[PDB]
């Protein structure tokens, strides 16, 4: 199973100066729930921005750097190596990789942040004509989660 796992805002911003533009603990829990025990694939820049691999799942990084090695991180150098990955596989970031992968994945787990942030990294444009809405659940606003947001699970038609 090959999925996209992304959070973007109303204009598809997913990042600004190596950072997430927004602090939203509920989306982290959401990420932890979906991807624990499975596989996360990410481009080199996405990985360096986190700075450490995420616990209790396989971390795969795509890069052309043949010297790249990080403890707890499996390296690939080919888009094509993604399809040899066993199990449920999540394309985690960033803009470059989503652009390469958005026409290949079976489905997408999108967190829509109902805001307009300044960004420099964008999720590629997509139309609902090509995606069925399997589920749409609003996140709950509270003390620590202060931005309206929505979990979408879109499946390709
Ligand atoms: N929400 C998110 O997912 C987050 C992402 N970001 C950002 O993403 C921003 C924009 O950079 P972006 O390009 O999107 O980052 P990516 O995560 O897509 O990393 C890009 C790199 O991935 C590797 N790569 C991609 N495709 C291939 C391929 N076909 N073959 C071999 N290697 C490949 C290359 O690494 P290499 O150059 O080493 O060969 C490439 O330079 C960065 O500024 C980073 O901060 C920031 C915050 C959050
Ligand atoms: C959650 C945000 C998020 N949500 C969803 N639904 N999908 C995603 N792909 C990402 C994402 C992301 C990027 C890789 C990112 C950048 C970052 O820049 C500092 C820190 C983290 C991060 C720090 C701590 N634990 C998990 C992830 C993730």
UniProtKB/Swiss-Prot annotation:
Q: Domain named DHFR: which ranges?
A: 1-156
Q: In which pathway does it act?
A: Cofactor biosynthesis; tetrahydrofolate biosynthesis; 5,6,7,8-tetrahydrofolate from 7,8-dihydrofolate: step 1/1
- The organism named in the record is Staphylococcus aureus
Q: What Gene Ontology cellular-component terms does the record carry?
A: cytosol
Which InterPro entries does the record match to this protein?
DHFR (IPR012259), DHFR-like_dom_sf (IPR024072), DHFR_CS (IPR017925), DHFR_dom (IPR001796)
Could you state one GO biological process linked to this protein?
folic acid metabolic process
The entry's protein name is: Dihydrofolate reductase
The residue range of the signal peptide is: none
Known CDD domains for this protein? DHFR
| Catalytic function, reaction form | (6S)-5,6,7,8-tetrahydrofolate + NADP(+) = 7,8-dihydrofolate + NADPH + H(+)
The EC number of this protein is 1.5.1.3
* Misc remark: There are two DhfR isozymes in S.aureus, this one is chromosomal and is sensitive to trimethoprim.
Tell me the gene name.
folA
Q: Which residues bind substrate?
A: 5-6, 27, 49, 57, 92
* Job description of the protein: Key enzyme in folate metabolism. Catalyzes an essential reaction for de novo glycine and purine synthesis, and for DNA precursor synthesis.
Q: Which family does it belong to?
A: Belongs to the dihydrofolate reductase family.
Give the matching PANTHER family.
Answer: DIHYDROFOLATE REDUCTASE
Which keywords are on file for this protein? NADP, One-carbon metabolism, Oxidoreductase
């Amino acid at each position: 199973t090959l999925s996209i796992l992304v959070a973007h805002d109303l204009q598809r911003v997913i990042g600004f100066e190596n950072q997430l533009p927004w602090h939203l603990p509920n989306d982290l829990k959401h990420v932890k729930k979906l991807s624990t025990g499975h596989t996360l694939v990410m481009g080199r820049k996405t990985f360096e921005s986190i700075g450490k691999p995420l616990p209790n799942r396989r971390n795969v990084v795509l890069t052309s750097d043949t010297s790249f090695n990080v403890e707890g991180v499996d390296v690939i150098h080919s888009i094509e190596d993604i399809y040899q990955l066993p199990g449920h596989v999540f394309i985690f970031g960033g803009q470059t990789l989503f652009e390469e992968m958005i026409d290949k994945v079976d489905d997408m787990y999108i967190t829509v942040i109902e805001g307009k942030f300044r960004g420099d990294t964008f999720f590629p444009p997509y139309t609902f004509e090509d995606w069925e809405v399997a589920s749409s659940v609003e996140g709950k606003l509270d003390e620590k989660n202060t931005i309206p947001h929505t979990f979408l699970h879109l499946i390709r038609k």
